[PDB]
Write a protein that binds this ligand. Sequence first.
Ligand SMILES: COC(=O)C[C@](O)(CCCC(C)(C)O)C(=O)O[C@@H]1C(OC)=C[C@]23CCCN2CCc2cc4c(cc2[C@H]13)OCO4
Ligand SMILES: [Mg+2]
Ligand SMILES: [Mg+2]
Ligand SMILES: [Mg+2]
Ligand SMILES: [Mg+2]
Ligand SMILES: [Mg+2]
Ligand SMILES: [Mg+2]
Ligand SMILES: [Mg+2]
Ligand SMILES: [Mg+2]
Ligand SMILES: [Mg+2]
Ligand SMILES: [Mg+2]
Ligand SMILES: [Mg+2]
Ligand SMILES: [Mg+2]
Ligand SMILES: [Mg+2]
Ligand SMILES: [Mg+2]
Ligand SMILES: [Mg+2]
Ligand SMILES: [Mg+2]
Ligand SMILES: [Mg+2]
Ligand SMILES: [Mg+2]
Ligand SMILES: [Mg+2]
Ligand SMILES: [Mg+2]
Ligand SMILES: [Mg+2]
Ligand SMILES: [Mg+2]
Ligand SMILES: [Mg+2]
Ligand SMILES: [Mg+2]
Ligand SMILES: [Mg+2]
Ligand SMILES: [Mg+2]
Ligand SMILES: [Mg+2]
Ligand SMILES: [Mg+2]
Ligand SMILES: [Mg+2]
Ligand SMILES: [Mg+2]
Ligand SMILES: [Mg+2]
Ligand SMILES: [Mg+2]
Ligand SMILES: [Mg+2]
Ligand SMILES: [Mg+2]
Ligand SMILES: [Mg+2]
Ligand SMILES: [Mg+2]
Ligand SMILES: [Mg+2]
Ligand SMILES: [Mg+2]
Ligand SMILES: [Mg+2]
Ligand SMILES: [Mg+2]
Ligand SMILES: [Mg+2]
Ligand SMILES: [Mg+2]
Ligand SMILES: [Mg+2]
Ligand SMILES: [Mg+2]
Ligand SMILES: [Mg+2]
Ligand SMILES: [Mg+2]
Ligand SMILES: [Mg+2]
Ligand SMILES: [Mg+2]
Ligand SMILES: [Mg+2]
Ligand SMILES: [Mg+2]
Ligand SMILES: [Mg+2]
Ligand SMILES: [Mg+2]
Ligand SMILES: [Mg+2]
Ligand SMILES: [Mg+2]
Ligand SMILES: [Mg+2]
Ligand SMILES: [Mg+2]
Ligand SMILES: [Mg+2]
Ligand SMILES: [Mg+2]
Ligand SMILES: [Mg+2]
Ligand SMILES: [Mg+2]
Ligand SMILES: [Mg+2]
Ligand SMILES: [Mg+2]
Ligand SMILES: [Mg+2]
Ligand SMILES: [Mg+2]
Ligand SMILES: [Mg+2]
Ligand SMILES: [Mg+2]
Ligand SMILES: [Mg+2]
Ligand SMILES: [Mg+2]
Ligand SMILES: [Mg+2]
Ligand SMILES: [Mg+2]
Ligand SMILES: [Mg+2]
Ligand SMILES: [Mg+2]
Ligand SMILES: [Mg+2]
Ligand SMILES: [Mg+2]
Ligand SMILES: [Mg+2]
Ligand SMILES: [Mg+2]
Ligand SMILES: [Mg+2]
Ligand SMILES: [Mg+2]
Ligand SMILES: [Mg+2]
Ligand SMILES: [Mg+2]
Ligand SMILES: [Mg+2]
Ligand SMILES: [Mg+2]
Ligand SMILES: [Mg+2]
Ligand SMILES: [Mg+2]
Ligand SMILES: [Mg+2]
Ligand SMILES: [Mg+2]
Ligand SMILES: [Mg+2]
Ligand SMILES: [Mg+2]
Ligand SMILES: [Mg+2]
Ligand SMILES: [Mg+2]
Ligand SMILES: [Mg+2]
Ligand SMILES: [Mg+2]
Ligand SMILES: [Mg+2]
Ligand SMILES: [Mg+2]
Ligand SMILES: [Mg+2]
Ligand SMILES: [Mg+2]
Ligand SMILES: [Mg+2]
Ligand SMILES: [Mg+2]
Ligand SMILES: [Mg+2]
Ligand SMILES: [Mg+2]
Ligand SMILES: [Mg+2]
Ligand SMILES: [Mg+2]
Ligand SMILES: [Mg+2]
Ligand SMILES: [Mg+2]
Ligand SMILES: [Mg+2]
Ligand SMILES: [Mg+2]
Ligand SMILES: [Mg+2]
Ligand SMILES: [Mg+2]
Ligand SMILES: [Mg+2]
Ligand SMILES: [Mg+2]
Ligand SMILES: [Mg+2]
Ligand SMILES: [Mg+2]
Ligand SMILES: [Mg+2]
Ligand SMILES: [Mg+2]
Ligand SMILES: [Mg+2]
Ligand SMILES: [Mg+2]
Ligand SMILES: [Mg+2]
Ligand SMILES: [Mg+2]
Ligand SMILES: [Mg+2]
Ligand SMILES: [Mg+2]
Ligand SMILES: [Mg+2]
Lengths: 105, 211, 159, 58
Amino acid sequence: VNVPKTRKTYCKGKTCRKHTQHKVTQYKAGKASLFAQGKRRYDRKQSGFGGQTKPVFHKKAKTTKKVVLRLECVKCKTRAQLTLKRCKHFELGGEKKQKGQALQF
Amino acid sequence: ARRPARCYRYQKNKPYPKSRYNRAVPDSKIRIYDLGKKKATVDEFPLCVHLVSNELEQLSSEALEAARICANKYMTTVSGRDAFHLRVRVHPFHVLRINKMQQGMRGAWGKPHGLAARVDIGQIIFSVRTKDSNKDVVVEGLRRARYKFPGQQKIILSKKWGFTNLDRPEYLKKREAGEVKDDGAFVKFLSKKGSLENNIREFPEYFAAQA
Amino acid sequence: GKSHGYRSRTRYMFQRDFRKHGAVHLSTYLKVYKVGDIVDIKANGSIQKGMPHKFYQGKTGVVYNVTKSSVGVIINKMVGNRYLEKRLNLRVEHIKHSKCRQEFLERVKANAAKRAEAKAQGVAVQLKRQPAQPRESRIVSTEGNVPQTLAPVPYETFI
Amino acid sequence: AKSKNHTAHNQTRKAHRNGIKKPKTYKYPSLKGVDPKFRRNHKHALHGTAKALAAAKK
RNA sequence: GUCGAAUUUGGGUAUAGGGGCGAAAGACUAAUCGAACCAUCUAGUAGCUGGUUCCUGCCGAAGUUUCCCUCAGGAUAGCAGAAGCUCGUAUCAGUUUUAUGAGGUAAAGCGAAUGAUUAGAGGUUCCGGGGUCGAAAUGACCUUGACCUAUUCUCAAACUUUAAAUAUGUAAGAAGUCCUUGUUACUUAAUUGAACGUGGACAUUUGAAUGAAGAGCUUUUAGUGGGCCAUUUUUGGUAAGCAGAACUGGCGAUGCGGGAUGAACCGAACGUAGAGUUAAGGUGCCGGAAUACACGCUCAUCAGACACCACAAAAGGUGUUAG
RNA sequence: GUGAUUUCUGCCCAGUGCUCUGAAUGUCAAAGUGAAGAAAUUCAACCAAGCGCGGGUAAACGGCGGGAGUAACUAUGACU
RNA sequence: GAAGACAUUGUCAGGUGGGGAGUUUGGCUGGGGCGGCACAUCUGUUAAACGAUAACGCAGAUGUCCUAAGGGGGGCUCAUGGAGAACAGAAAUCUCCAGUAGAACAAAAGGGUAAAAGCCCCCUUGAUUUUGAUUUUCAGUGUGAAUACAAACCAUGAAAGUGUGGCCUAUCGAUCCUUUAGUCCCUCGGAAUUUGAGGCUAGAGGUGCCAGAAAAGUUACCACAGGGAUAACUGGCUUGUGGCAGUCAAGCGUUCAUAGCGACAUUGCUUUUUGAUUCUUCGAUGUCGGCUCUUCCUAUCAUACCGAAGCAGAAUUCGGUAA
RNA sequence: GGUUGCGGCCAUAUCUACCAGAAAGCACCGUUUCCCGUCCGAUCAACUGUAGUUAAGCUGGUAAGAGCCUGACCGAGUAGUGUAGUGGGUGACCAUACGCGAAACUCAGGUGCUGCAAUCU
Ligand SMILES: COC(=O)C[C@](O)(CCCC(C)(C)O)C(=O)O[C@@H]1C(OC)=C[C@]23CCCN2CCc2cc4c(cc2[C@H]13)OCO4
Ligand SMILES: [Mg+2]
Ligand SMILES: [Mg+2]
Ligand SMILES: [Mg+2]
Ligand SMILES: [Mg+2]
Ligand SMILES: [Mg+2]
Ligand SMILES: [Mg+2]
Ligand SMILES: [Mg+2]
Ligand SMILES: [Mg+2]
Ligand SMILES: [Mg+2]
Ligand SMILES: [Mg+2]
Ligand SMILES: [Mg+2]
Ligand SMILES: [Mg+2]
Ligand SMILES: [Mg+2]
Ligand SMILES: [Mg+2]
Ligand SMILES: [Mg+2]
Ligand SMILES: [Mg+2]
Ligand SMILES: [Mg+2]
Ligand SMILES: [Mg+2]
Ligand SMILES: [Mg+2]
Ligand SMILES: [Mg+2]
Ligand SMILES: [Mg+2]
Ligand SMILES: [Mg+2]
Ligand SMILES: [Mg+2]
Ligand SMILES: [Mg+2]
Ligand SMILES: [Mg+2]
Ligand SMILES: [Mg+2]
Ligand SMILES: [Mg+2]
Ligand SMILES: [Mg+2]
Ligand SMILES: [Mg+2]
Ligand SMILES: [Mg+2]
Ligand SMILES: [Mg+2]
Ligand SMILES: [Mg+2]
Ligand SMILES: [Mg+2]
Ligand SMILES: [Mg+2]
Ligand SMILES: [Mg+2]
Ligand SMILES: [Mg+2]
Ligand SMILES: [Mg+2]
Ligand SMILES: [Mg+2]
Ligand SMILES: [Mg+2]
Ligand SMILES: [Mg+2]
Ligand SMILES: [Mg+2]
Ligand SMILES: [Mg+2]
Ligand SMILES: [Mg+2]
Ligand SMILES: [Mg+2]
Ligand SMILES: [Mg+2]
Ligand SMILES: [Mg+2]
Ligand SMILES: [Mg+2]
Ligand SMILES: [Mg+2]
Ligand SMILES: [Mg+2]
Ligand SMILES: [Mg+2]
Ligand SMILES: [Mg+2]
Ligand SMILES: [Mg+2]
Ligand SMILES: [Mg+2]
Ligand SMILES: [Mg+2]
Ligand SMILES: [Mg+2]
Ligand SMILES: [Mg+2]
Ligand SMILES: [Mg+2]
Ligand SMILES: [Mg+2]
Ligand SMILES: [Mg+2]
Ligand SMILES: [Mg+2]
Ligand SMILES: [Mg+2]
Ligand SMILES: [Mg+2]
Ligand SMILES: [Mg+2]
Ligand SMILES: [Mg+2]
Ligand SMILES: [Mg+2]
Ligand SMILES: [Mg+2]
Ligand SMILES: [Mg+2]
Ligand SMILES: [Mg+2]
Ligand SMILES: [Mg+2]
Ligand SMILES: [Mg+2]
Ligand SMILES: [Mg+2]
Ligand SMILES: [Mg+2]
Ligand SMILES: [Mg+2]
Ligand SMILES: [Mg+2]
Ligand SMILES: [Mg+2]
Ligand SMILES: [Mg+2]
Ligand SMILES: [Mg+2]
Ligand SMILES: [Mg+2]
Ligand SMILES: [Mg+2]
Ligand SMILES: [Mg+2]
Ligand SMILES: [Mg+2]
Ligand SMILES: [Mg+2]
Ligand SMILES: [Mg+2]
Ligand SMILES: [Mg+2]
Ligand SMILES: [Mg+2]
Ligand SMILES: [Mg+2]
Ligand SMILES: [Mg+2]
Ligand SMILES: [Mg+2]
Ligand SMILES: [Mg+2]
Ligand SMILES: [Mg+2]
Ligand SMILES: [Mg+2]
Ligand SMILES: [Mg+2]
Ligand SMILES: [Mg+2]
Ligand SMILES: [Mg+2]
Ligand SMILES: [Mg+2]
Ligand SMILES: [Mg+2]
Ligand SMILES: [Mg+2]
Ligand SMILES: [Mg+2]
Ligand SMILES: [Mg+2]
Ligand SMILES: [Mg+2]
Ligand SMILES: [Mg+2]
Ligand SMILES: [Mg+2]
Ligand SMILES: [Mg+2]
Ligand SMILES: [Mg+2]
Ligand SMILES: [Mg+2]
Ligand SMILES: [Mg+2]
Ligand SMILES: [Mg+2]
Ligand SMILES: [Mg+2]
Ligand SMILES: [Mg+2]
Ligand SMILES: [Mg+2]
Ligand SMILES: [Mg+2]
Ligand SMILES: [Mg+2]
Ligand SMILES: [Mg+2]
Ligand SMILES: [Mg+2]
Ligand SMILES: [Mg+2]
Ligand SMILES: [Mg+2]
Ligand SMILES: [Mg+2]
Ligand SMILES: [Mg+2]
Ligand SMILES: [Mg+2]
Ligand SMILES: [Mg+2]
Ligand SMILES: [Mg+2]
């Protein structure tokens, strides 16, 4: 797909509480952090002997990932997520589809 | 390597035509269905004799063909190639399947094996038209063809004028009138419905109601 | 594998009636529905929104709701050895008023009449319906009608 | 070892031992799933005429 | 086989169980070896196999749904028992009738659409090609193709205008019908409407049939979750005492009479007995019951003899019978 | 490993191993170092063997092709 | 004497480590295996005109694609064909007539659509925010998908309106954990500030065996619980294949259908072929061949007596009664 | 009765060919300053109602017309079907019994009905 880098849409931010312009961008996970309670508990669990103490996933099936757009109200600063269908090529550059032109050269 | 007809005599399955859905199916062994003087006029051949099924069954295309050759062969050499008109009245549109043959009964769907006409009781298989003075000769044709077919069929003298839809007098009454007009090998009748104008054009020899 | 989607098996059922395609005539929308109204259900394949599922085709129910472009019909579907209550949000293009009660209402309005029209005369009413009774005696005449005598016919072939 | 696949055999026999229970009917059925704008108003409508009928036995 | 040596052999001594020892066979390690023997953990676990102990009375199944590393097992719903409880001419129905819907199967159709298919006939080309005249021609004339017109023979599970039977939704009133005119924040131009009402009018021919050893409701629990068969509908298969669906009725769980025999056919469903009458099937003798009555037919140097059922076909006969 | 004698033991180090007076700026642990922070901590640089790169090795494990044409009958194919 | 703060040793840290340990090494399936996917799904048919409905039934499809191919508005009419216009031809671009959709609407197919649902243009983000109800599958759970409202905020249009993604019927995902968005909210339990951690609400990272384990082989050295729910041997049903026999008679046979043969067709029998099946046996019915010996069948090779011949004789061939 | 604007059922309203249409109305029709749209004032926009015409639209009538609608003991109680039997038949299939019952065919009849508002010899 191709989606626009901007978006007039609902902002639910106490002051905003109306349709405003959002700057659009793609969600990107976030560094791990040990000290997460889970990572904490895991780390312990894996000490000493016994080997892998927890399942390790192998039977991968999907060949994609749902895109998440981060929508940022340029007034009230707040953000909203909005998640697209599965697609195999994503871009929020542009190059918009064009009228009815020739196949070149 | 053809299976015995025995294996397909009865109408056990639903009509399996050649279709988008079927496709790879062999040719019908019988391909001509009108032989003898088929160009001939309706007036030429008054008498009409039929080969008529007495069974709900299935005739192979191969036995259709063999029969066809048998009767035409006889009818010509005994009474000439222009004596008669033989119409195979039955077309083999139903495809018969075969489970040709690691596996066994797992996934057993046949491949097309051959064609067959499916035929009612009372259903006409062959029809012949001639001159009255040939009756015997024709009936002997259909009698011999019979030996080519599973199941009982019986030969029946028509009341009709040739391949026409009219018994002998009613055609005559219609003809010695004005109403009939020659076509290719069949005929056209004057309708009382439709445009008076181009109805009068056609059939000039009506519209006096006499000769 | 098998297939069992929402509109599966509905080829002819949501089909459109010979020479009757296109816009729906405007009376379909001028018709008015109140709660308690009995409607019959029939999908209009031309109208994809607000469609009943196939099972509810040819079913009669009672309106329980009236919204902008729809009525809510409640049908008793019997799943198992029992009925459950099912509620259908149908657009008005898939619903029509049933005549399943017209004969009842015509019957009642009329039963009120000959009930008063009898009482205010001198009783003697009789207004339950009765089934077809056997017919009575009668005398058929020959005058102008002597019995024609038919026999069975021989066997003949014509073909 | 393949075995049977499906049958409805005998199932309506069972269905009929203990019913096909008819559908059960009530005066005053639930307003469940009724238009909220209606229902909101209808409430006040009812509250009112209630007050009116206490007002008849003052 | 070998028999003076890589010979045989006593005793003593060392090597010990994932260890030994092995000129190597997974051999040998006390009748134990692809991991010895002894005790213990230990009554190891077992969706698998076996067995499970008195009588009578009443009721009485399932082999199906959905989920499961699920397919010889479980959970879940169903079927079953129990205990009842609230009520009672009430309300109830594997049924009809009446009124009103739904449906695209059977049939039918194809000189109606789509798709197939046999045949000619008549047209039309500045134009698919051939051939004669030709300098050619948007030339003429034959010709065979395609198309067109009106006809003709034949077809469809995945075609169709039409369109059954059987099945199938709803309705047949007191929770009803009519009048008067309150409430609201919904809704209307509008006290307009919508919903819910207050007050008033009409009783069992109060609104079809037939039935009802009553109706309604609650809790909890077993077994079952291999099914098989018959008529009809029906898929795969040449077919099957084969494989798989639909509806009902069965067998399984069930004896009794009949089909000699036999799970499922026909008759008929079981407390102990008397008398009577029957069913299906029989009545020469076996064998209870007419070697009954009547009209034909049939003579077989492999006659025939009663559903399911325990097979026979094309084709023939100057045997005989009636047409 | 192979298996008396006689004879003879061809070519292949790409792979898998094994191996090396080899190279070096690639990856690379704990400790140690530096940087930020109020510290817990985060980031960074440096970095052993190993890996990777390079060389050796077949009496290590093992391997040791396909399609056309071509000589005065045909056939064959030294030859391409 | 040698060696020397180096070895050695002790604790962590990386490499190596089938030498050894422990464990695992899908399901359905006309046995299992190889294959395929009937394992989660969609269209049409099977499907027996409501609904439901099986097989490794039939013909196809799904793990995607689209900022427009989503939303609103206006304008327009498609496939095809006829007739016309320089180069220009079968096919370029221009016009007019006809045109029920014979087109197009991403994709399988089926529905659906004509001042549109198709084509061209204009303006856009409703593909958004909140939390419930409902329909399909159903246990009347979940998930997917969908429907009609309520409360917002918007888009478009003169407006009525329409818009909660793609015309409809498929296009997908629990708990634990991580991660992000959200209010600036609750907690860290002796009291505070600040980091940090933990909660709440909504998303993403995925389980395709799709209600969702973390998983390689070999065993002929083999083991146990079971299975006749299941193969290999006998037996049963079937008889496609094999084998054997007919009917018709176009032909063959110098001439001449049938002396002897016999095409195209077509009806059968047989159960020493091989298949199909899986009903009996898995707490065991001794598998091939031969030897020995008995008995049976006849579709007769010889031998007895016959009939026929394209029987001169001789020899042969065909047929009968014959085991 | 005509006509117009808005309609409802959506062919008895459609299609093919020809003829007829008073009056009003519709219409065709004139113009390009203005709003507005085009390659083109053809469509679309505006202005005149003046300059012109029933030719076309429109309405109606004709036609052994095409189509479509309705009817009928026309075909047919046919096909098909629910129920029954220890009915026939080697089978394939087929009669019978108590019911339900088509489609094509054939023949006749028909060719828009009508609501609100305004207008009209
Ligand atoms: C494949 O061969 C076997 O299975 C042989 C045997 O072990 C026969 C040996 C039996 C004893 C040990 C008793 O000899 C056996 O189990 O026989 C079964 C057996 O053993 C008693 C009886 C079986 C099954 C019914 C009769 N049949 C005969 C013998 C046999 C022969 C086979 C066969 C199976 C049978 C079985 O498959 C191929 O050939
Ligand atoms: Mg620790
Ligand atoms: Mg913030
Ligand atoms: Mg049949
Ligand atoms: Mg079949
Ligand atoms: Mg096999
Ligand atoms: Mg096979
Ligand atoms: Mg297959
Ligand atoms: Mg296949
Ligand atoms: Mg015959
Ligand atoms: Mg005809
Ligand atoms: Mg399907
Ligand atoms: Mg239309
Ligand atoms: Mg939608
Ligand atoms: Mg199994
Ligand atoms: Mg089985
Ligand atoms: Mg089962
Ligand atoms: Mg051990
Ligand atoms: Mg040890
Ligand atoms: Mg011992
Ligand atoms: Mg020993
Ligand atoms: Mg125990
Ligand atoms: Mg033990
Ligand atoms: Mg098990
Ligand atoms: Mg009982
Ligand atoms: Mg699982
Ligand atoms: Mg068992
Ligand atoms: Mg009922
Ligand atoms: Mg259907
Ligand atoms: Mg049919
Ligand atoms: Mg037919
Ligand atoms: Mg028809
Ligand atoms: Mg057709
Ligand atoms: Mg059909
Ligand atoms: Mg009923
Ligand atoms: Mg009653
Ligand atoms: Mg009673
Ligand atoms: Mg009682
Ligand atoms: Mg229970
Ligand atoms: Mg239970
Ligand atoms: Mg199960
Ligand atoms: Mg259970
Ligand atoms: Mg039975
Ligand atoms: Mg049992
Ligand atoms: Mg019994
Ligand atoms: Mg008995
Ligand atoms: Mg018997
Ligand atoms: Mg019976
Ligand atoms: Mg005896
Ligand atoms: Mg006796
Ligand atoms: Mg007597
Ligand atoms: Mg019989
Ligand atoms: Mg005979
Ligand atoms: Mg005779
Ligand atoms: Mg070596
Ligand atoms: Mg050796
Ligand atoms: Mg050595
Ligand atoms: Mg050499
Ligand atoms: Mg070399
Ligand atoms: Mg090498
Ligand atoms: Mg470090
Ligand atoms: Mg190698
Ligand atoms: Mg030191
Ligand atoms: Mg190791
Ligand atoms: Mg191991
Ligand atoms: Mg398996
Ligand atoms: Mg398995
Ligand atoms: Mg197999
Ligand atoms: Mg496989
Ligand atoms: Mg299955
Ligand atoms: Mg599965
Ligand atoms: Mg159905
Ligand atoms: Mg279901
Ligand atoms: Mg489509
Ligand atoms: Mg429009
Ligand atoms: Mg979205
Ligand atoms: Mg869900
Ligand atoms: Mg789905
Ligand atoms: Mg769209
Ligand atoms: Mg999916
Ligand atoms: Mg946050
Ligand atoms: Mg704190
Ligand atoms: Mg505290
Ligand atoms: Mg504390
Ligand atoms: Mg704080
Ligand atoms: Mg903080
Ligand atoms: Mg995850
Ligand atoms: Mg699973
Ligand atoms: Mg769950
Ligand atoms: Mg699953
Ligand atoms: Mg695994
Ligand atoms: Mg192992
Ligand atoms: Mg060994
Ligand atoms: Mg055989
Ligand atoms: Mg055979
Ligand atoms: Mg054979
Ligand atoms: Mg012949
Ligand atoms: Mg001769
Ligand atoms: Mg000859
Ligand atoms: Mg044999
Ligand atoms: Mg078995
Ligand atoms: Mg067997
Ligand atoms: Mg066994
Ligand atoms: Mg045994
Ligand atoms: Mg024995
Ligand atoms: Mg004998
Ligand atoms: Mg003999
Ligand atoms: Mg001779
Ligand atoms: Mg003889
Ligand atoms: Mg003998
Ligand atoms: Mg004997
Ligand atoms: Mg005028
Ligand atoms: Mg201008
Ligand atoms: Mg103009
Ligand atoms: Mg204008
Ligand atoms: Mg005029
Ligand atoms: Mg007009
Ligand atoms: Mg007409
Ligand atoms: Mg009949
Ligand atoms: Mg019937
Ligand atoms: Mg019968
Ligand atoms: Mg009949």
